[PDB]
Each structure stands twice: as structure tokens, then as C-alpha cells.
Ligand binder design. Structure first.
Ligand SMILES: Nc1nc2c(ncn2[C@@H]2O[C@H](CO)[C@@H](O)[C@H]2OP(=O)(O)O)c(=O)[nH]1
Ligand SMILES: [Ca+2]
Ligand SMILES: [Ca+2]
Length: 104
């Protein structure tokens, strides 16, 4: 079974931890990868009910299981905060234009 389902993509907790650790390390070193500069602040325009505190940062999580290194980011993202806590897993899949919806 999937811990998080983003559209057709199935993710386990380990996938999220792996993705988060990569994004968080870049954040701490003050570096970004990709033309969209990940990781970067997530403003929560959608108004999701994140239990943990801000600031939030979005980092792409890939369906292939590979850690993002600069190419196409895809539709899925892990959102983490300043204390290295997972705020949530979101996706552009099933959402209008550039909006996000939560992964179930
Ligand atoms: N939908 C959405 N985009 C955000 C948010 N915070 C920052 N962004 C950025 O605002 C712009 C319009 O969505 C994009 O550059 C998007 O970045 P990404 O495309 O890198 O996710 C947010 O809370 N929601
Ligand atoms: Ca996996
Ligand atoms: Ca692989």
C-alpha cells in the first residue's frame, strides 16, 4: 500500500524522507538546483492546514524513486519547514493550472 498517493504516483514514507533530506541539505547550504531554483519558499497560497509551523519550502519528489538533481521537477512536491519536519506532500496533478492539491 501507498503512504501517499499523488495522482497515479505511489510513495512510501522512505521516499519522502529521502527526498526531504536532499532538499533540506541544499537549503542549509544555501544552494538551489534546476531552472525553477529548488528548494524554495512555499507560500501556501492554497491554504492547506499544515500542523507544523512555517516557513515552508517545496522540493520535488520523483515517481522514479530518484532524487531530484535539476531536470524536470514533475508534478509532486514534499513540503518541509525550518526544523526539518514534513509539512505535507502535494501535487499539481488533478489541480487547475499552477495550483496544488494534497496527495491522499
Ligand atoms: N501554487 C503555489 N505556487 C507557489 C506557492 N508558493 C510559491 N509558489 C510559486 O509561485 C508561482 C505560481 O504558482 C510559481 O513560481 C510557484 O513555484 P513552483 O512552480 O516552483 O511550485 C504556493 O503556495 N502555491
Ligand atoms: Ca518508492
Ligand atoms: Ca533508480
Amino acid at each position: 500500500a501507498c503512504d501517499y498517493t499523488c495522482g497515479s504516483n505511489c510513495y512510501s514514507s522512505s521516499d519522502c524522507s529521502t527526498a526531504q533530506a536532499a532538499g533540506y541539505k541544499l537549503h542549509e547550504d544555501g544552494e538551489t538546483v534546476g531552472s525553477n531554483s529548488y528548494p524554495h519558499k512555499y507560500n501556501n497560497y492554497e491554504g492547506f492546514d499544515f500542523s507544523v509551523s512555517s516557513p515552508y519550502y517545496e522540493w520535488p519528489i520523483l515517481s522514479s524513486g530518484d532524487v531530484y538533481s535539476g531536470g524536470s521537477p514533475g508534478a509532486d512536491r514534499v513540503v518541509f519547514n525550518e526544523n526539518n519536519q514534513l509539512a505535507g506532500v502535494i501535487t499539481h496533478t488533478g489541480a487547475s493550472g499552477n495550483n496544488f492539491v494534497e496527495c491522499t
